[PDB]
């Protein structure tokens, strides 16, 4: 049984990319390629991060949400880890607990997620738990 590996050269500067303020890529997911955690697709929509998470995947991904109550808005960093709900439960045990690797890298957000129901990745329901 292969232990998880992570490209942490590709997968620091796809985390680098999302807090850039010279970015306009406001998500971006780690996959497994084999068993090494690599960059998956990257977007400027949110929507189309949604449309990532399939039930037969499991991924993690960092996004920047726009928040604010005043004029003055304020940007908050999500870390997701996907399991989606088809997926193996050696896998999605494995994909659990691979998250500390991946914090490795994505040290910085305003709360983390753990989620397997599609959903609670709707950005209402993210921006509602980033409140607390």
């Given at each position: 049984s292969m232990a998880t590996k992570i490209d942490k050269e590709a997968c620091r500067a796809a985390y680098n990319l999302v807090r850039?303020?010279?970015?306009?890529?406001?998500w971006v997911t780690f996959k497994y390629d084999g068993s090494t955690i690599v960059p998956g697709e990257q977007g400027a929509e949110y929507q189309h991060f949604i449309q990532?998470?399939?039930?037969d995947v499991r991924l993690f991904a960092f996004v920047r949400f726009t928040t604010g109550d005043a004029m003055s808005k304020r940007s908050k960093f999500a870390l997701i880890t996907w399991i989606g709900e088809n997926v193996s439960g050696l896998q999605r045990a494995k994909t659990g607990t691979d998250k500390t690797l991946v914090k490795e890298v994505?040290?910085?957000?305003?709360k983390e997620f753990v989620i397997?129901?599609?959903?609670?990745?709707?950005e209402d329901f993210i921006k509602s738990e980033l409140k607390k």
């Open positions: 850039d303020d010279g970015s306009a890529v406001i990532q998470c399939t039930d994505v040290q910085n957000f305003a397997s129901d599609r959903k609670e990745l709707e």
